[PDB]
Amino acid sequence: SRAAELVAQMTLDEKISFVHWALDPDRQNVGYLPGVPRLGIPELRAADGPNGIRLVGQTATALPAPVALASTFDDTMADSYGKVMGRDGRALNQDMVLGPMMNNIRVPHGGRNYETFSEDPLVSSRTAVAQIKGIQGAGLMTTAKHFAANNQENNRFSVNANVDEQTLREIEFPAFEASSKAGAASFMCAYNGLNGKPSCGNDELLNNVLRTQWGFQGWVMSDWLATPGTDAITKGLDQEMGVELPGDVPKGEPSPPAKFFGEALKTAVLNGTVPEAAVTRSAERIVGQMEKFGLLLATPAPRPERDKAGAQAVSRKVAENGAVLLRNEGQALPLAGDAGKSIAVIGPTAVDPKVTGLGSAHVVPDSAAAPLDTIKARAGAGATVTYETGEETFGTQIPAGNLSPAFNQGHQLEPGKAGALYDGTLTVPADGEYRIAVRATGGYATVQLGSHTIEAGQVYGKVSSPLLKLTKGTHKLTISGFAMSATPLSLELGWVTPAAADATIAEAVKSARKARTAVVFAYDDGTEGVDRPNLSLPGTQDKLISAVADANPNTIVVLNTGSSVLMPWLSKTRAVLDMWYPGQAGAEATAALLYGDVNPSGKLTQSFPAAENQHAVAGDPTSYPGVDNQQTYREGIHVGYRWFDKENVKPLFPFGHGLSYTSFTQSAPTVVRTSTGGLKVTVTVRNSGKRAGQEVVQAYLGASPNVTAPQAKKKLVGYTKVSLAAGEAKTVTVNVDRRQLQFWDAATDNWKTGTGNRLLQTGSSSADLRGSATVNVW
Numbered sequence: 001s002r003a004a005e006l007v008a009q010m011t012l013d014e015k016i017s018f019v020h021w022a023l024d025p026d027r028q029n030v031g032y033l034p035g036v037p038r039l040g041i042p043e044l045r046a047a048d049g050p051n052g053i054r055l056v057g058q059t060a061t062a063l064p065a066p067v068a069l070a071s072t073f074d075d076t077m078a079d080s081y082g083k084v085m086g087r088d089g090r091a092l093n094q095d096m097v098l099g100p101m102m103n104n105i106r107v108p109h110g111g112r113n114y115e116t117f118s119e120d121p122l123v124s125s126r127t128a129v130a131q132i133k134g135i136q137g138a139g140l141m142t143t144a145k146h147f148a149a150n151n152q153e154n155n156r157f158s159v160n161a162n163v164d165e166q167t168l169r170e171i172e173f174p175a176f177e178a179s180s181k182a183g184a185a186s187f188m189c190a191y192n193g194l195n196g197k198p199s200c201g202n203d204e205l206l207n208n209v210l211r212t213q214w215g216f217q218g219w220v221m222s223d224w225l226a227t228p229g230t231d232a233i234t235k236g237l238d239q240e241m242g243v244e245l246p247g248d249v250p251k252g253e254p255s256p257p258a259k260f261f262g263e264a265l266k267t268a269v270l271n272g273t274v275p276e277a278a279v280t281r282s283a284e285r286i287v288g289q290m291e292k293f294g295l296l297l298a299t300p301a302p303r304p305e306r307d308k309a310g311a312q313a314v315s316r317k318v319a320e321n322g323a324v325l326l327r328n329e330g331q332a333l334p335l336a337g338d339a340g341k342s343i344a345v346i347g348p349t350a351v352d353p354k355v356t357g358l359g360s361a362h363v364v365p366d367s368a369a370a371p372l373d374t375i376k377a378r379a380g381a382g383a384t385v386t387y388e389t390g391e392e393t394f395g396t397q398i399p400a401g402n403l404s405p406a407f408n409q410g411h412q413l414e415p416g417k418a419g420a421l422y423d424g425t426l427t428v429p430a431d432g433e434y435r436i437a438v439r440a441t442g443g444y445a446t447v448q449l450g451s452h453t454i455e456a457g458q459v460y461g462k463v464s465s466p467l468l469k470l471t472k473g474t475h476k477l478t479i480s481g482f483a484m485s486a487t488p489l490s491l492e493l494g495w496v497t498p499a500a501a502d503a504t505i506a507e508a509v510k511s512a513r514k515a516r517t518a519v520v521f522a523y524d525d526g527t528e529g530v531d532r533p534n535l536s537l538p539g540t541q542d543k544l545i546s547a548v549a550d551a552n553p554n555t556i557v558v559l560n561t562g563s564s565v566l567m568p569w570l571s572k573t574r575a576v577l578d579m580w581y582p583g584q585a586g587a588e589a590t591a592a593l594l595y596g597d598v599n600p601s602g603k604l605t606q607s608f609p610a611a612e613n614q615h616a617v618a619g620d621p622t623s624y625p626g627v628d629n630q631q632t633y634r635e636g637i638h639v640g641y642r643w644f645d646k647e648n649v650k651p652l653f654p655f656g657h658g659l660s661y662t663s664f665t666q667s668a669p670t671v672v673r674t675s676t677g678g679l680k681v682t683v684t685v686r687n688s689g690k691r692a693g694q695e696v697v698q699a700y701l702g703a704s705p706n707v708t709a710p711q712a713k714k715k716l717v718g719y720t721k722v723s724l725a726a727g728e729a730k731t732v733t734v735n736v737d738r739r740q741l742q743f744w745d746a747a748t749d750n751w752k753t754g755t756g757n758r759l760l761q762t763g764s765s766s767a768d769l770r771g772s773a774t775v776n777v778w
């Protein structure tokens with residue numbers, strides 16, 4: 001390997017150039033390094049993110065949400081997803097993607113739950129490794145993130161999470177451990193603290209666990225402005241990400257200075273307070289990955305062009321395989337015969353599709369079809385398909401009546417500039433619930449109305465419009481923002497009053513009375529940076545669905561929601577199809593699933609609570625979100641379905657749930673120990689219905705009678721998805737790795753096998769387990 005010898009030839013300045021990301025000269029991505037031309041080491045570029053390459057001013061494939069990929073329960077889908085991402089990044093001049101994210105889904109409100117995989121470590125580990133191998137086999141480096149315990153957005157910049165060792169080793173770490181062992185090029189350390197030190201300054205995490213124990217060969221970068229000090233380079237952090245940015249920086253200006261790993265690091269090396277060996281080691285790790293990826297060849301592999309058609313096909317297939325049919329009463333779905341030829345489509349995401357979540361993972365595709373249009377196509381020319389908005393997101397510009405001083409709507413700022421924008425008062429005509437709508441183009445704005453903060457700008461979608469409970473009278477309103485370099489910032493301030501919502505609802509209801517079938521699209525607003533304030537659909541969408549389902553007895557809800565959501569209207573509907581955020585081909589996939597051209601086969605990767613405050617972290621500020629910047633993961637390993645099982649609570653929908661348009665039968669499982677002490681579980685699955693479909697056979701193991709440490713009531717220990725023609729049977733193998741039969745023994749500081757007679761259950765969801773065997777584990 002040449003990397004150590006090349007670094008040995010570098011000056012201290014040349015070494016320090018690798019350890020802090022600078023701005024992209026092209027002003028598109030997250031970070032750039034200049035390399036060292038005299039040594040044949042090229043530039044390095046990194047872009048977000050976990051569901052496709054995000055570049056300012058350059059579109060790329062917007063894949064379905066990470067949660068949708070995980071809900072396929074299919075490692076081959078993750079491989080395909082990764083190959084598309086890697087090829088797009090290579091084609092678009094990048095060398096790394098900043099993903100995947102693989103934090104556990106712990107908090108139902110967690111803003112970024114859409115951007116990660118599961119509440120279960122096995123599903124997270126399998127999805128992460130298959131995607132990383134796909135991205136890296138296409139030539140692009142990955143960045144497993146956010147190491148570790150970044151399971152919420154609330155106060156992520158300052159909170160410290162105290163997590164016991166067994167919980168870390170069994171729940172949060174497995175996907176990172178598997179990603180390290182699969183050769184992920186890099187890790188990104190988390191904003192939050194872990195067990196008393198910032199993750200990005202935690203030697204136990206980044207050196208002892210990650211390197212001494214797991215053997216990680218790559219480098220660790222910080223999250224954006226998460227580096228805690230210059231000394232962090234001696235604690236396992238190799239690379240500082242972030243600089244101060246008023247907003248956008250024009251092309252041709254210098255990159256703003258690094259805070260801790262630039263000038264300050266040079267000063268600390270030259271005065272002896274940081275060993276030069278630490279800089280050398282970090283540069284060697286980076287350059288070693290560049291070598292492994294072929295970047296140090298005198299003549300490197302030529303970059304590919306985009307394969308837009310193949311990317312569309314994979315995006316479609318993932319959405320078709322990860323959508324979850326939650327409810328389907330009396331074969332309401334698939335739509336067929338007259339029921340499929342007279343439809344009232346309702347909801348804003350039927351015409352402005354919900355393609356990706358909000359935040360750094362947001363991707364704008366070249367184009368995305370509208371579900372209204374793909375439903376119209378599929379229903380056929382003879383059909384009647386109507387459309388009503390149902391749920392307005394902007395409403396109308398707030399009357400000048402209600403604003404003091406008046407707000408100058410529209411143009412705010414000339415390209416480049418930042419500023420305060422507005423300092424004034426909003427007068428509310430009547431106590432009620434109002435959407436307050438902010439529509440920014442050409443930059444970003446931040447609106448503070450009373451205690452509420454609203455961010456608006458491209459990664460936050462076309463409009464930001466939270467429903468706020470406001471009393472009659474005045475409320476403080478301040479605005480500020482910034483323009484991008486090419487484009488002035490323009491900004492509109494609107495509202496949707498209670499009356500305006502009722503009128504839009506009534507118009508939708510009328511269309512539902514007229515059609516045989518009502519298909520209501522409903523969406524949520526999960527974002528990086530803050531958690532959802534509650535688990536309900538935002539706005540007035542509950543009231544909409546309830547009114548439509550009261551008026552039409554054939555109401556189907558299509559969810560474009562990133563995580564769990566409450567469904568108080570559930571019993572009034574006949575079917576609910578969860579498309580997650582389904583990516584650029586989501587509309588095509590949605591029409592195909594609705595008509596049964598594809599048979600739903602996704603399963604949930606997380607538990608949906610039955611009530612706002614009944615879930616694993618509810619009712620305890622020291623567990624969520626923390627107090628005085630401190631939280632403790634008091635549930636331990638009993639998170640997600642493990643918590644519902646421990647507490648004997650029935651969730652709205654359980655882990656592993658997902659219906660099909662066909663039926664399946666399963667035999668009892670047969671089990672044989674493998675040569676490594678794992679298990680090979682065999683189940684014969686028959687499609688006993690009339691349609692081809694896929695089933696996911698899930699294996700759960702009960703507690704060892706020989707272990708006194710915490711154990712889950714049942715643990716997912718393997719799964720295998722199978723495709724069956726109508727009438728067809730296949731004998732399916734479910735592999736159980738030896739590690740799944742073990743627990744983390746916080747005495748021995750090591751894995752220990754949980755021996756003795758244990759219950760093995762097989763079936764098609766955590767709540768539909770028909771097959772069983774006693775397994776004597778040894």
Ligand SMILES: OC[C@H]1O[C@@H](O)[C@H](O)[C@@H](O)[C@@H]1O
Nearest residue numbers: 030048049098145223224360
């Ligand atoms: O965009 C750069 C980074 O921004 C941070 O706010 C996010 O936490 C990271 O996931 C992302 O990669």
